[PDB]
Structure 1
Amino acid sequence: AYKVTLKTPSGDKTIECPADTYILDAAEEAGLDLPYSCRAGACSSCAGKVAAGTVDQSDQSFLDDAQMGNGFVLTCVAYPTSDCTIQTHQEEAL
């Protein structure tokens, strides 16, 4: 699994997330209550920003190329591919 450090507005929490599990799902199951709505990669509710490490969000559709190049991620459809750090609650920053 990968260590995913969620940098939330109320501090950091590092969870383990298997390669085959979406970050939001692992976070929810670890007891975090992160924003979401569609869970299909088609909105901005679950947006985060990758500060370090890599994800695979090939499933996503809402973010544009520039947003992804600036590290935004739709956590509901993102798998980790390394140990990573994701700032949560980033929809207003998009």
Structure 2
Amino acid sequence: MYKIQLVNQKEGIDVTIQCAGDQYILDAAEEQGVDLPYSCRAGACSTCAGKLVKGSVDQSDQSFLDEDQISKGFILTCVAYPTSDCVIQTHQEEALY
């Protein structure tokens, strides 16, 4: 399983969880007691946006983020399967706007 560090100083989040390659990051976090934002849970909005600081994901079901947003590291945590150990900033929807 992948090691996923989730951070947000404003929200008081600083936790590293395990996530299998076949579970989405949001779901693994919520299963482990972490309170992350989401609404559609289907990759079609920005509510669950996070930002990769390090690592990689497979978020190929996502349908919202453009190529420049992806290039900067943004991810939709509700449809992102980890493909490496990651460090992710949570609650990053503002950084898109």
Instruction: State whether TM-score is above 0.5.
Output: yes
Structure 2 residues not aligned, in runs of 5+: none
What one-letter code is carried by the residue in structure 1 that aligns with 2:24? Y
Q: 2:37 aligns with which of 35, 38, 50?
A: 35
Matched residue of 2:87: which SS? strand
Segments of structure 1 that go 5 or more residues without pairing to the other structure are: none
TM-score (structure 2 length as normaliser): 0.94
What is the CA deviation profile of residues 41-61 of structure 1, one whole-angstrom value per residue up to 9, with x for unaligned ones?
Answer: 000000000000111101100
In the alignment, the residues of structure 2 paired with residue 11 and residue 25 of structure 1 have an alpha-carbon distance, to the nearest angstrom, of 16
Alpha-carbon distance, 1:27 to partner: 0.4
Instruction: Extract structure 1 runs of 4+ deviating beyond 6 A.
Output: none
Matching residue within 62, 65, 71 for 1:63: 65
Q: For the residues of structure 2 that align with 1:62 and 1:27, how far apart are their CA atoms?
A: 22
- Residue 88 of structure 2 is matched in structure 1 by 86
- What is the match of residue 18 of structure 2? 16
C-alpha RMSD of the superposition:
0.7
Deviations 1:65-94 (A, max 9, x none): 000000000000000000001100000111
Tell me how far apart the structure 2 counterparts of residues 40 and 11 of structure 1 sit (CA, whole Å): 23
TM-score (norm 1): 0.97
